[PDB]
Write a protein that holds these residues in place. Structure first.
Motif, PDB file in Angstrom:
ATOM      1  N   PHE A  36       0.836  -1.204   0.000  1.00 18.94           N
ATOM      2  CA  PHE A  36       0.000   0.000   0.000  1.00 18.94           C
ATOM      3  C   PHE A  36       0.868   1.250   0.000  1.00 18.94           C
ATOM      4  CE2 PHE A  36      -2.668  -3.275   1.803  1.00 18.94           C
ATOM      5  CZ  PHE A  36      -3.841  -3.120   1.084  1.00 18.94           C
ATOM      6  N   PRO A  37       0.356   2.339  -0.584  1.00 15.64           N
ATOM      7  CA  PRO A  37      -0.929   2.440  -1.283  1.00 15.64           C
ATOM      8  C   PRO A  37      -0.889   1.685  -2.595  1.00 15.64           C
ATOM      9  CG  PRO A  37      -0.146   4.611  -0.562  1.00 15.64           C
ATOM     10  CD  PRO A  37       1.021   3.648  -0.484  1.00 15.64           C
ATOM     11  N   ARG A  38      -2.044   1.269  -3.105  1.00 12.80           N
ATOM     12  CA  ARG A  38      -2.086   0.484  -4.339  1.00 12.80           C
ATOM     13  C   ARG A  38      -2.061   1.422  -5.541  1.00 12.80           C
ATOM     14  NH1 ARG A  38      -6.917  -2.614  -4.737  1.00 12.80           N
ATOM     15  NH2 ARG A  38      -7.914  -0.999  -3.435  1.00 12.80           N
ATOM     16  N   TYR A  39      -0.996   2.213  -5.623  1.00 13.21           N
ATOM     17  CA  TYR A  39      -0.833   3.083  -6.782  1.00 13.21           C
ATOM     18  C   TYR A  39      -0.974   2.261  -8.050  1.00 13.21           C
ATOM     19  CZ  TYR A  39       0.995   6.412  -3.393  1.00 13.21           C
ATOM     20  OH  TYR A  39       1.152   7.255  -2.309  1.00 13.21           O
ATOM     21  N   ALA A  48      -4.701  10.369  -4.494  1.00 13.00           N
ATOM     22  CA  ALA A  48      -3.791  10.815  -3.449  1.00 13.00           C
ATOM     23  C   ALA A  48      -2.421  11.151  -4.038  1.00 13.00           C
ATOM     24  CB  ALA A  48      -3.684   9.756  -2.351  1.00 13.00           C
ATOM     25  N   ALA A  49      -1.881  10.263  -4.884  1.00 11.54           N
ATOM     26  CA  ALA A  49      -0.573  10.515  -5.495  1.00 11.54           C
ATOM     27  C   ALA A  49      -0.572  11.813  -6.294  1.00 11.54           C
ATOM     28  CB  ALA A  49      -0.179   9.353  -6.397  1.00 11.54           C
ATOM     29  N   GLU A  50      -1.593  12.019  -7.124  1.00 10.90           N
ATOM     30  CA  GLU A  50      -1.674  13.251  -7.901  1.00 10.90           C
ATOM     31  C   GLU A  50      -1.716  14.465  -6.988  1.00 10.90           C
ATOM     32  OE1 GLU A  50      -5.131  12.207 -10.157  1.00 10.90           O
ATOM     33  OE2 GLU A  50      -4.064  10.509 -11.023  1.00 10.90           O
ATOM     34  N   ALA A  51      -2.443  14.362  -5.872  1.00  7.30           N
ATOM     35  CA  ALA A  51      -2.509  15.473  -4.932  1.00  7.30           C
ATOM     36  C   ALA A  51      -1.127  15.792  -4.374  1.00  7.30           C
ATOM     37  CB  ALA A  51      -3.504  15.162  -3.810  1.00  7.30           C
ATOM     38  N   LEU A  52      -0.327  14.761  -4.098  1.00  8.86           N
ATOM     39  CA  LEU A  52       1.035  14.961  -3.614  1.00  8.86           C
ATOM     40  C   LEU A  52       1.911  15.690  -4.622  1.00  8.86           C
ATOM     41  CD1 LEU A  52       1.603  11.462  -2.097  1.00  8.86           C
ATOM     42  CD2 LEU A  52       1.548  13.591  -0.795  1.00  8.86           C
ATOM     43  N   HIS A  53       1.563  15.648  -5.907  1.00  8.57           N
ATOM     44  CA  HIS A  53       2.309  16.347  -6.942  1.00  8.57           C
ATOM     45  C   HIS A  53       1.671  17.658  -7.361  1.00  8.57           C
ATOM     46  CE1 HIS A  53       3.686  12.135  -7.323  1.00  8.57           C
ATOM     47  NE2 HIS A  53       4.853  12.738  -7.469  1.00  8.57           N
ATOM     48  N   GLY A  54       0.819  18.240  -6.522  1.00  8.94           N
ATOM     49  CA  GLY A  54       0.265  19.551  -6.787  1.00  8.94           C
ATOM     50  C   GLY A  54      -1.042  19.593  -7.549  1.00  8.94           C
ATOM     51  N   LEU A  59      -6.544  19.825  -2.198  1.00  5.28           N
ATOM     52  CA  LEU A  59      -6.812  18.508  -1.624  1.00  5.28           C
ATOM     53  C   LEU A  59      -5.679  18.049  -0.706  1.00  5.28           C
ATOM     54  CD1 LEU A  59      -8.007  15.845  -1.122  1.00  5.28           C
ATOM     55  CD2 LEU A  59      -7.510  15.113  -3.450  1.00  5.28           C
ATOM     56  N   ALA A  60      -4.434  18.156  -1.157  1.00  9.84           N
ATOM     57  CA  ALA A  60      -3.341  17.592  -0.363  1.00  9.84           C
ATOM     58  C   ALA A  60      -3.109  18.341   0.947  1.00  9.84           C
ATOM     59  CB  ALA A  60      -2.039  17.567  -1.168  1.00  9.84           C
ATOM     60  N   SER A  61      -3.637  19.552   1.090  1.00  7.50           N
ATOM     61  CA  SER A  61      -3.369  20.314   2.302  1.00  7.50           C
ATOM     62  C   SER A  61      -4.217  19.869   3.480  1.00  7.50           C
ATOM     63  CB  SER A  61      -3.574  21.808   2.062  1.00  7.50           C
ATOM     64  OG  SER A  61      -4.944  22.104   1.915  1.00  7.50           O
ATOM     65  N   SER A  62      -5.280  19.103   3.250  1.00  8.48           N
ATOM     66  CA  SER A  62      -6.084  18.562   4.338  1.00  8.48           C
ATOM     67  C   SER A  62      -5.457  17.248   4.783  1.00  8.48           C
ATOM     68  CB  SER A  62      -7.531  18.332   3.910  1.00  8.48           C
ATOM     69  OG  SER A  62      -8.196  17.526   4.866  1.00  8.48           O
ATOM     70  N   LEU A  69      -8.385   9.122   1.818  1.00 11.39           N
ATOM     71  CA  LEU A  69      -8.132   8.460   0.542  1.00 11.39           C
ATOM     72  C   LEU A  69      -7.339   7.167   0.737  1.00 11.39           C
ATOM     73  CD1 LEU A  69      -7.284  11.424  -1.915  1.00 11.39           C
ATOM     74  CD2 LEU A  69      -9.427  10.201  -1.706  1.00 11.39           C
ATOM     75  N   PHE A  70      -6.327   7.181   1.597  1.00 14.99           N
ATOM     76  CA  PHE A  70      -5.552   5.955   1.798  1.00 14.99           C
ATOM     77  C   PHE A  70      -6.373   4.874   2.482  1.00 14.99           C
ATOM     78  CE2 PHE A  70      -2.056   9.167   1.705  1.00 14.99           C
ATOM     79  CZ  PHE A  70      -1.557   8.762   0.490  1.00 14.99           C
ATOM     80  N   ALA A  71      -7.293   5.270   3.370  1.00 15.65           N
ATOM     81  CA  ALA A  71      -8.152   4.290   4.016  1.00 15.65           C
ATOM     82  C   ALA A  71      -9.125   3.678   3.020  1.00 15.65           C
ATOM     83  CB  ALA A  71      -8.892   4.931   5.183  1.00 15.65           C
ATOM     84  N   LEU A  72      -9.692   4.505   2.143  1.00 17.09           N
ATOM     85  CA  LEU A  72     -10.579   3.989   1.110  1.00 17.09           C
ATOM     86  C   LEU A  72      -9.829   3.045   0.185  1.00 17.09           C
ATOM     87  CD1 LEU A  72     -12.593   7.254   0.224  1.00 17.09           C
ATOM     88  CD2 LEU A  72     -13.424   5.291   1.561  1.00 17.09           C
TER      89      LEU A  72
END
Ligand SMILES: Cc1cn(C2CCN(Cc3cncc(Oc4cccc(Cl)c4)c3)CC2)c(=O)[nH]c1=O
Ligand SMILES: Cc1cn(C2CCN(Cc3cncc(Oc4cccc(Cl)c4)c3)CC2)c(=O)[nH]c1=O
Ligand SMILES: [Cl-]
Ligand SMILES: [Cl-]
Ligand SMILES: [Cl-]
Ligand SMILES: [Cl-]
Lengths: 190, 184
Positions: A36-39, A48-54, A59-62, A69-72
């Motif tokens: 995990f995560p199952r990218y 989630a990954a896209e959010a980490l890249h801006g 989204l990524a600031s929360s 997202l990782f729990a889902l």
């Protein structure tokens, strides 16, 4: 038996997963693994990954949004996890629920006894019904290695150690990089 | 045929969905309805509502975080939606994708040609594959500041034909005449 390998990025989890898988099989145990995560498979993981890249605006600031997202992502994998556990003697996960507690608390400058960690435990284990690991193995690293956001990673490694000390979510083992693999397999699966 | 009813909270959509269903069924069409968010059915939906009541830490403060949960709710329903459309003459949705565009842009003080609206359209229609509605019916009626801007963004969305054809109706719309207008 369900085992989760945990630690900050760059700690060396993938190599430990491999060493342990080999040690288990040398002892007569069958092994399956899952990361995990199952990218690439989970829509929630890829958002989630896209959010980490801006991407995806704010989204990524929360902190709690990203944790959700990782729990889902894991909730989508619960049937796979159960199938592996029925089919194999040992299932080893490269990251599991504790990763969410560690990074979330760290981002919030909290510790393992704080709100973020308890929220993760409630939502992932109690509500979503994810199976509790029999073991959580922390591959612990120094502050210098963890930092190599640097501060976020350093705080995550400290929370990890607190989680292990409190037995968060089950039994923990704390190991270093050059672990004796046959000894660790005998300890995990006695 | 897929119809989405849209409008600000309290506009009276639920009543309009009911009347419109009756008009269709009275006209010989079979009808199914589905409301978003799917509170009580969707994990993503229920977390969103809980966030709206102050739960889940900082989640509710992120506009895109809330929008993503509502989009993930719909994504969980994409096959349900397609099943109803294949099974029934008319499918009526109480809130759909345009809701995400309207509340999100309004919360960002943007307009319908701004980033949020284009983002919703991109992630929900193109990426997640949600079916574009045949009709979006805006019920435009006579914090409050958020609700006011949302109703204007909604009207901008209708004016630009966002995501497909729109109709803009008021509180006293004739449901039987509206069904006849929507009818293929
Ligand atoms: C499986 C899993 C994984 N993670 C992390 C694992 C590490 N990556 C990469 C990473 C590693 N180190 C620092 C980072 O910076 C940020 C920046 C913004 C958000 C987050 Cl969560 C982390 C990011 C992020 C998700 C979680 O937070 N929760 C999880 O449940
Ligand atoms: C189906 C759907 C619904 N909504 C809204 C609809 C209105 N409710 C209730 C509401 C009505 N008016 C103002 C509100 O204030 C907030 C407060 C926090 C977040 C948001 Cl998005 C709105 C909340 C919130 C979700 C979206 O934003 N996107 C959607 O896709
Ligand atoms: Cl690693
Ligand atoms: Cl094997
Ligand atoms: Cl150090
Ligand atoms: Cl309403």
């Amino acid at each position: 038996m369900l085992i989760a390998i945990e630690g900050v990025d760059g700690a060396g989890k993938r190599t430990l997963v491999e060493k342990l898988s080999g040690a288990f099989r040398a002892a007569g145990r069958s092994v399956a693994t899952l990361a995990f995560p199952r990218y690439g498979q989970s829509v929630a993981a890829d958002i989630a990954a896209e959010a980490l890249h801006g991407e995806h605006g704010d989204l990524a600031s929360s902190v709690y949004a990203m944790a959700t997202l990782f729990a889902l992502d894991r909730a989508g994998a619960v049937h796979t996890i159960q199938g592996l556990c029925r089919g194999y003697d040992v299932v080893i996960l490269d990251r599991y629920v504790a990763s969410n507690a560690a990074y979330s608390a760290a981002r919030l400058h909290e510790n393992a006894a704080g709100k973020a960690a308890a929220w993760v435990q409630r939502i992932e284990f109690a509500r979503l019904g994810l199976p509790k690991p029999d073991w959580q193995v922390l591959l612990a690293v120094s502050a210098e290695l963890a930092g190599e956001d640097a501060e976020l990673q350093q705080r995550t490694g400290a929370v990890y150690a607190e989680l292990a000390a409190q037995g968060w979510g089950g039994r923990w083992l704390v190991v270093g990089a050059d672990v004796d693999p046959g000894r660790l397999a005998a300890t995990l699966a006695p």
